Amino acid sequence: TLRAAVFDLDGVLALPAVFGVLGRTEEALALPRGLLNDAFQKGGPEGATTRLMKGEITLSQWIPLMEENCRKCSETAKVCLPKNFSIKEIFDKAISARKINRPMLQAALMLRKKGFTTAILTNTWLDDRAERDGLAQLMCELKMHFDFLIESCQVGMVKPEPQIYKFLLDTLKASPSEVVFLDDIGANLKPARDLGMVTILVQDTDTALKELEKVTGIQLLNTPAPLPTSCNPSDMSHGYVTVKPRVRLHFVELGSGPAVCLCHGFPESWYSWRYQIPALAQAGYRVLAMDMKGYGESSAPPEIEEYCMEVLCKEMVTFLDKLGLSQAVFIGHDWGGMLVWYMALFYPERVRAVASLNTPFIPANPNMSPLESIKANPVFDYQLYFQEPGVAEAELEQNLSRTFKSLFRASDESVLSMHKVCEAGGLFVNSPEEPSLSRMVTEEEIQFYVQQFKKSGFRGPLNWYRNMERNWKWACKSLGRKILIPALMVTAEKDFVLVPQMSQHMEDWIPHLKRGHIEDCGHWTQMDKPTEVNQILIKWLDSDAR
Amino acid sequence: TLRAAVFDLDGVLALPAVFGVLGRTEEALALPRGLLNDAFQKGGPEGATTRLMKGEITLSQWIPLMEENCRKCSETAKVCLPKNFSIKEIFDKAISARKINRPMLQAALMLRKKGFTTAILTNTWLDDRAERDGLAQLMCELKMHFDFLIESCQVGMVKPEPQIYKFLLDTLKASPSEVVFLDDIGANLKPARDLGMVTILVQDTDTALKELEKVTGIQLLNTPAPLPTSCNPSDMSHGYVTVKPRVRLHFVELGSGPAVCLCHGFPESWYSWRYQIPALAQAGYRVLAMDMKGYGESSAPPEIEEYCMEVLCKEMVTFLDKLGLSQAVFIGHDWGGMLVWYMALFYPERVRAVASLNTPFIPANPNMSPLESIKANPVFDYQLYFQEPGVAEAELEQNLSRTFKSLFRASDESVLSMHKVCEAGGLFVNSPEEPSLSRMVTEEEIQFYVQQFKKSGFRGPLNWYRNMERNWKWACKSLGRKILIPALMVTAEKDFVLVPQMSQHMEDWIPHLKRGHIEDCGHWTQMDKPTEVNQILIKWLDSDAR
Ligand SMILES: CC(C)(C)c1cc(Br)c(O)c(CNCCCc2ccccc2)c1
Ligand SMILES: CC(C)(C)c1cc(Br)c(O)c(CNCCCc2ccccc2)c1
């Protein structure tokens, strides 16, 4: 039975292929057919190209040898190469043009999801060109999705040499009949077949995937749209900053480019951004996904006043100071969204741009006590239940798995009504003891939140709600201001507490506000509709934040 | 007795002042004298500018109010403002032109070094202009050097209001006679004097500093050149990446821009880069200062083979992968310098540029065993002493304070001869029990290294030396290559083991190599000559690495 799938890079996982560019260049320059492909393969196992592919020489050392082979070939063919003929230019363009073959990667991702071991086996070179970063980026994006990456220039062997196939099997820890091997070069497929592997000659992707699904018995074509790439907590870079003596903030960090600081809601984690972290890093951003104060690996002091907006914002400014960042774009959800609006109002110099998911910006009413304002909207009743220290902690900490399974559900799966929470005597009083698992989360993902909340519980998280008066007095100092930095408001159709209509007057205070809207999306925006969140955020970052 | 020094920002810590730009603009445009300074202060305590300085409105909201005041003033003066008059343009230019007053900052740094509490007290605004980052950067650089930063727009009070002076004293926890207060505005100096503070009216910096040194009794003028800013370990962002099941790498991270990965030598720490970290971050780079495998907070497995160059390099590539970095510039010293050359030879696509301090690049000799090569140079005798597992560990771990105090000394302070180490029976056999403290290090800095080495000791660090044969076989695979990526070799005149002449043939293998050279510098380059290292590295980064 098959249990391993091996893919070539050029012409399989990445298109268009290099062999095609030599043929394309011959045609564009009206050179004899095959002239450049001949100079490229000149000397066969003893030639310049084999030396490059084995890692004996670098790509920049190889360029003049390929130039001399082209001259020899042209001399023999009794033709002249054009006036401004350049091997460097031809390869720079071809490498830059080559992009991931998305349906082929999707098929590899599905086989791996189904328990296959996956690998990339490639005849490649040591790239020292000034433009090498583009290729480094492609390989980075690709390699993360596979168990192994075997590069000819690192192992000192090349396809079709028999040794590289024995090396492949040793690394896979598999017998040949257990392996599918996909290649666009029939000659490089021959030794794998000779060993007894299943082989697929890739011309067009659709046919190759039909052969691959027929031989594996796994649906790979016509499949439902997959979710964005998620995060494995043990595979991330974890950062820690002391903002004051008893307060440390933890964050997960991925990517390069402008800093993007993700701020989660209640009762969440950095992990609530799992579907956004890889997508934003891939889009050219340096992502910093926080455990907000009171959560996960960040400090959770017990005092209510440690959680007022003024202090939380001051600490986030200190966080930037200690990291040596003059600015970050701030993106928040729920309580994180309320924080990012206040970061924009009090520290605009430090905020590159601001985005909120669900949480609208509503100026404080100086003529009404915040408790009166909460009482005025029936959907905010749960905030009154959260006031008394210890009451909601007892209910939320009683059974962690039940807490997260009851909370984290799509709009059509709800188990909690948020009206008359105080009257009912809790959030979960009419909820099952053993809730079903929402289609939004796996059992493993629920257990990650359970493990994180074992450290500090719900005191610090609930304390974010216990500073209504303090936050109202501080917010009133900002009433004459407008938010004039780049701003995005993302509404969720089916969030029945943070209703889209609550955001309706935001342009009065944020005149240049840009918007996004997600249909059939409940409160847990990032995990409910991750593809759409990623689309809205990347589009806005690229246009408004750099 | 004085124990606190307070500095204004505009016209004191940062020059040229804003008041000067309004006067300069009046003159350049031939407007009536004082017209713009009049419109700026219009309405006094009730005016637009006071509202801005108190944080009632932002800088972008203030712009049209200042425009209306300029029009009113011009109408009263019976003059016309020019055709393309713009308050936005005038302030963008002035803010951008304003730079840190380096001698004033140096004086604050010295008073703080001598035990004074220091603070910045400033009438400032909430900056929401599109070009706000420049000012955010200035404030970041400045604020790190002071105990407190009091901004009028954050406290809702302005100089010369009496309340802000009482607020200052409360934050300083000092009586007025204990405070020196420096301001360029005599009217803002008046309430501090009225309270009994020592006050200095800053016109030219030299006179202000003469008054400041006369009143404090501390030399501030004509002082020796200070060292670059160092790092406080508890103030840094600390990152952790698992590269494989039992291996985690720790690093300290500071700044934004291209990633710069600093790789220390034997037997060191991320902390060996303490003088480079702030300077490189300030120069526009994202610094990642590693604890190399076997050191500090990084994992230290016991096996010799975990420390061969091939594995150490593979792990550094995985480190980049997990952080989501396609490249980093790699800068190494000693064993770190040997590593970065190998990163350049085996992973050029991942190396933006490469620099080594002291460690030259010498290709492996395939016709001589590495042990024969070590035996051929008498200064390399200590490497033979390091071979036998446990021998050097016993000597180095016996008394940590003695180990680091004996090792870390300037060229004119040496206590260790490196010739006939095996014959002598150790590195410290002719060294004192209680070595004196080198002028390069403080007692506290020695204790940091002592604390770091308490975790894993010297087994992992010494294992970097125990892979001579393995490293030689791997290096031989690279003999046909050249290093063609941007490269810098920094030699140290007085490193008596890694002599500058050892680097003499490097251009044969690295044709485009750039160089730096430090006179009167021993082995501990970064701490021996930090100002000169910083100069050489920043110049090379800005020209060759981005
Ligand atoms: C209490 C839970 C987590 C179940 C919940 C469920 C829904 Br549906 C929801 O919309 C919110 C929103 N919490 C808002 C907190 C931040 C905030 C406070 C005051 C005003 C606006 C936003 C919370
Ligand atoms: C052993 C100590 C730390 C005292 C020392 C003192 C001096 Br002075 C010195 O120059 C070196 C250099 N160590 C070099 C290690 C890396 C390397 C190995 C082989 C060849 C070159 C460089 C080490």
Domains and CATH numbers, chain A: 1-16+97-217 (3.40.50.1000), 17-96 (1.10.150.240), 236-546 (3.40.50.1820)
Residue A322 — φ and ψ, nearest 5°? -65, -30
- The DSSP code for B145 is T
Q: How far apart are CA A181 and CA A8, in angstroms?
A: 8
Contact A422, A395 (CB under 8 A): no
Ligand 1 centroid – CA A339 distance (Å): 13
Q: Do the chains contact at A237 and B235, CB–CB below 8 Å? A: no
* Tokens describing residue B405: 């105090």
* Distance from chain centroid for Cα B83: 46
Over its C-alpha atoms, chain B yields an Rg (Å, rounded) of 29
- The answer, yes or no, to whether any atom of ligand 1 lies below 6 A from the CB of A125, is no
The partner residues of B241 in beta bridges, in order of sequence, read B249
Q: Do the chains contact at A241 and B237, CB–CB below 8 Å? A: yes
Q: Which positions in chain A touch B346 (Cβ < 8 Å)?
A: 126, 154
- The DSSP code for B243 is E
Ligand 1 centroid – CA A497 distance (Å): 6
By the CB < 8 Å criterion, does B254 face chain A?
Answer: yes
Q: Do the chains contact at B235 and A322, CB–CB below 8 Å? A: yes
Resolution (A): 1.8
The residue annotated as part of the active site, out of B165, B285, B307, B465, is B465
Q: Catalytic: A334?
A: yes
Burial class (CB in 10 A: 0-12, 13-18, 19+), B239: buried
Strands B286-290 and B247-254: antiparallel
Select from A125, A244, A256 the residue whose CB has the most chain B CBs within 10 Å, as the one to mutate to test that interface.
A256
H/E stretch holding A305 reads none
Residue with tokens 């840190």: B100
A265 closest CA partner among A338, A166, A202: A338
B3 closest CA partner among B180, B147, B170: B180
Burial class (CB in 10 A: 0-12, 13-18, 19+), A187: exposed
Q: How far apart are CA A81 and CA B137, in angstroms?
A: 54
Angle at A514 between CA A510 and CA A516, to 5 degrees: 130
3-state secondary structure of A419: coil
Q: How far apart are CA B123 and CA B303, in angstroms?
A: 60
Residue with tokens 């500018």: B49
Residue A276 one-letter amino acid: Q
Q: Which positions in chain A touch B323 (Cβ < 8 Å)?
A: 237, 253-255
Q: Catalytic: A342?
A: no
CA of A56: which chain B residue's CA is closest? B480
3-state secondary structure of B224: coil
Q: How far apart are CA B347 and CA B476, in angstroms?
A: 16
Q: How far apart are CA B189 and CA B370, in angstroms?
A: 71
A373 closest CA partner among A502, A527, A256: A502
CA quadruple A479, A480, A484, A485: dihedral, nearest 10:
-50
Q: How far apart are CA A219 and CA A200, in angstroms?
A: 17
Strands A328-333 and B259-263: unpaired
Angle at A42 between CA A41 and CA A48, to 5 degrees: 85
* Tokens describing residue B37: 């300074």
Contact A106, A223 (CB under 8 A): yes
Cα–Cα separations (whole angstroms), residue B539 to A36, A504, B515, B545: 42, 52, 11, 10
Q: How far apart are CA A209 and CA A215, in angstroms?
A: 10
- The answer, yes or no, to whether any atom of ligand 1 lies below 6 A from the CB of A341, is no
Cα–Cα separations (whole angstroms), residue B185 to A324, B11, B190, B192, B196: 31, 9, 9, 12, 17
The partner residues of B386 in beta bridges, in order of sequence, read none
Q: How far apart are CA A361 and CA B36, in angstroms?
A: 36
Q: How far apart are CA B491 and CA A82, in angstroms?
A: 46
Q: Give the sheet arrangement for strand A148-151, strand by strand.
A: A148-151, A117-122, A4-7, A179-183, A198-201
User: What sign does the dihedral A392-A398-A404-A409 (CA atoms) show?
Assistant: negative
- Taking residue B394's Cβ as centre, other Cβ atoms within 10 Å add up to 10
Q: Which atom from ligand 2 is nearest to the alpha carbon of B383?
A: 1
CA of B154: which chain A residue's CA is closest? A346
Q: Which atom from ligand 1 is nearest to the alpha carbon of A360?
A: 21
Contact B352, B431 (CB under 8 A): no
* Tokens describing residue A207: 């046919």
